[PDB]
Amino acid sequence: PDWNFEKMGIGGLDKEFSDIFRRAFASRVFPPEIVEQMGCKHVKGILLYGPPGCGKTLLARQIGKMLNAREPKVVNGPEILNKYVGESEANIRKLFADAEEEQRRLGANSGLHIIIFDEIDAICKQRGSMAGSTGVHDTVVNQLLSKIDGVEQLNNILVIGMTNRPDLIDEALLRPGRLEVKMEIGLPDEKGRLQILHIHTARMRGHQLLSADVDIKELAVETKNFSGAELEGLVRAAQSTAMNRHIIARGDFLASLENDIKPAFGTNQEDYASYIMNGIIKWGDPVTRVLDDGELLVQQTKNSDRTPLVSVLLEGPPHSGKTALAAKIAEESNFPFIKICSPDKMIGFSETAKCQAMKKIFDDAYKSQLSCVVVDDIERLLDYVPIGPRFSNLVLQALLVLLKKAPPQGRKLLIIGTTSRKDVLQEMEMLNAFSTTIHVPNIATGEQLLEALELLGNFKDKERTTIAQQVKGKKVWIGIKKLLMLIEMSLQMDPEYRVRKFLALLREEGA
Amino acid sequence: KPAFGTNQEDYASYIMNGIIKWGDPVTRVLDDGELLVQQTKNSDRTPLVSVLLEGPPHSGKTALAAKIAEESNFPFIKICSPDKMI
Ligand SMILES: Nc1ncnc2c1ncn2[C@@H]1O[C@H](COP(=O)(O)OP(=O)(O)OP(=O)(O)O)[C@@H](O)[C@H]1O
Ligand SMILES: Nc1ncnc2c1ncn2[C@@H]1O[C@H](COP(=O)(O)OP(=O)(O)OP(=O)(O)O)[C@@H](O)[C@H]1O
Ligand SMILES: Nc1ncnc2c1ncn2[C@@H]1O[C@H](COP(=O)(O)OP(=O)(O)O)[C@@H](O)[C@H]1O
Asked if A362 and A497 sit in the same domain, the reply is: no
Q: Residue A447: name the closest of A475, A423, A489 by CA.
A: A475
* CA within 13 Å, CB half, A148: 25
Test mutation, A184, A405, A434, chain B, max B CBs within 10 A: A405
Asked if A380 and A415 sit in the same domain, the reply is: yes
CB B76 within 8 A of CB B5: yes
CA distance A167 to A49: 10
Q: Nearest 10 degrees: CA dihedral of A209, A212, A217, A218?
A: -120
What is the radius of gyration, based on Cα positions, of chain A?
A: 30
- The reply to whether residue B86 touches residue A409, judged by beta carbons under 8 angstroms, is no
What is the radius of gyration, based on Cα positions, of chain B?
A: 14
The ligand with the least distance to the CA atom of B53 is 2
Q: Which residues of A146-167 are buried (b: 16+ CB within 10 A; e: fewer)?
A: ebbbeeeebebbbbbbbbeeee
Pairing of strands A309-315, A45-49: unpaired
Asked if A313 and A388 sit in the same domain, the reply is: yes
Residue B60 is assigned to a ligand binding site: yes
Residue B19 is assigned to a ligand binding site: yes
Using alpha carbons only, what angle is made at residue A342 by residues A338 and A346, rounded to the nearest 5 degrees?
Answer: 125
CB A193 within 8 A of CB A230: no
Q: How far A402 CA lies from chain B's nearest CA (Å)?
A: 7
CA distance A128 to A334: 45
Residue of A nearest to B3 (CA): A175
CA distance A231 to A255: 10
Q: Which residues of B17-39 are buried (b: 16+ CB within 10 A; e: fewer)?
A: eeeeeeeeeeeebbeebeeebee
* Residues 6+ positions from A53 with CB-CB distance below 8 Å: A227, A228, A229, A230, A265
Test mutation, A401, A409, A411, A435, chain B, max B CBs within 10 A: A401
CB A266 within 8 A of CB A368: yes
Largest CA distance in chain B: 38
Q: Residue A188: name the closest of A305, A50, A57 by CA.
A: A50
Count of CB atoms situated within 10 Å of the CB of A279: 9
Chain A positions with Cβ closer than 8 Å to B:
167, 171, 175-176, 306, 308, 355, 359, 397-398, 401-402, 405-406, 408-409, 432
Output the residue whose Cα is nearest ligand 1's atom 14: A321
Helices (H) and strands (E) in chain B, counts: 2, 0
Distance A104 CA to ligand 1 centre (A): 72
CA distance A140 to A138: 6
Strand partners, A371: A337, A413
**Which of helix, strand or coil describes residue A160?**
strand
**Termini Cα distance of chain B:** 26
Asked if A486 and A389 sit in the same domain, the reply is: no
CA distance A432 to A425: 9
The total number of residues shown for chain B amounts to: 86
Q: In A200-344, which ranges are E strands?
A: 309-315, 337-341
Output the residue whose Cα is nearest ligand 3's atom 25: A229
Strands of the sheet with A436-439, listed across from one edge: A337-341, A370-375, A412-417, A309-315, A436-439
**Which of helix, strand or coil describes residue A277?**
coil
Asked if A318 and A434 sit in the same domain, the reply is: yes
Residue B27 is assigned to a ligand binding site: no
Q: The domain that contains A478 carries what CATH number?
A: 1.10.8.60
* Residues 6+ positions from A475 with CB-CB distance below 8 Å: A444, A445, A446
Residue B61 is assigned to a ligand binding site: yes
- The reply to whether residue B17 touches residue A405, judged by beta carbons under 8 angstroms, is no
CA distance A248 to A268: 31
Question: Closest partner residue to A401 among B13, B58, B83, by Cβ?
Answer: B83
Largest CA distance in chain A: 102
Q: Please report the sign of the dihedral spanned by the C-alpha atoms of residue A226, residue A230, residue A232, residue A233.
A: negative
* Residue A23 per-residue DSSP state: I
CA distance A194 to A216: 6
CA distance A94 to A113: 12
Asked if A482 and A369 sit in the same domain, the reply is: no
Q: Residue A9: name the closest of A67, A56, A79, A43 by CA.
A: A56
Asked if A347 and A488 sit in the same domain, the reply is: no
CB A205 within 8 A of CB A197: no
CA distance A11 to A302: 28
Active site residue A376: yes
* Annotated catalytic residue within A19, A138, A383, A481: A481
Asked if A372 and A453 sit in the same domain, the reply is: no
Asked if A360 and A490 sit in the same domain, the reply is: no
Q: Which residues of A180-214 are buried (b: 16+ CB within 10 A; e: fewer)?
A: bbebebbbbbeebbbbbbebbeeebeeeeebeeeb
CB A346 within 8 A of CB A299: no
What is the helix (H) or strand (E) element at residue A264, kind and residue range?
none
Position A142, amino acid: N
CA distance B7 to A189: 29
Q: Please report the sign of the dihedral spanned by the C-alpha atoms of residue A169, residue A170, residue A173, residue A177.
A: positive
Closest ligand 1 atom, residue A321 Cα: 18
Asked if A409 and A353 sit in the same domain, the reply is: yes
* Annotated catalytic residue within A377, A437, A445, A482: A377
Residues of the domain holding A420? 271-441
Asked if A285 and A432 sit in the same domain, the reply is: yes
- DSSP-derived secondary structure for A281-311: ---SHHHHHHHHHHHHHHHHHHT-SS-SEEE
- DSSP-derived secondary structure for A359-400: HHHHHHHHTSSEEEEEE--HHHHTT-BTTTTB--HHHHHHHH
| Ligand 1 pocket by Cβ (under 6 Å) | A 277-278, 280-282, 287, 318-324, 377, 420, 479-481, 484
Burial class of A252 by CB neighbour count within 10 A (0 to 12, 13 to 18, 19+): middle
CA distance A442 to A432: 24
Output the residue whose Cα is nearest ligand 1's atom 2: A281
CB A227 within 8 A of CB A57: no
* Annotated catalytic residue within A404, A461, A462, A494: A404
Q: Please report the sign of the dihedral spanned by the C-alpha atoms of residue A8, residue A11, residue A15, residue A20.
A: negative
CA distance B13 to A92: 39
Annotated resolution, angstroms: 4.4
Active site residue A404: yes
Position A374, amino acid: V
Active site residue A322: yes
CA distance B28 to B30: 6
Strands of the sheet with A45-49, listed across from one edge: A72-75, A113-117, A157-163, A45-49, A181-184
CA distance A426 to A377: 16
Chain A and chain B share a number of CB contacts under 8 A equal to 24
Q: The domain that contains A370 carries what CATH number?
A: 3.40.50.300
Distance B59 CA to ligand 2 centre (A): 6
The ligand with the least distance to the CA atom of A120 is 3
CA distance A209 to A307: 49
* Annotated catalytic residue within A301, A376, A422, A466: A376
Measured from the CB, is residue B65 less than 6 Å from ligand 2? no
Asked if A275 and A424 sit in the same domain, the reply is: yes
CA distance A451 to A464: 10
Burial class of A405 by CB neighbour count within 10 A (0 to 12, 13 to 18, 19+): middle
List C-alpha distances in Å: A497 to A290, A318, A347, A360, A509.
37, 29, 41, 53, 20
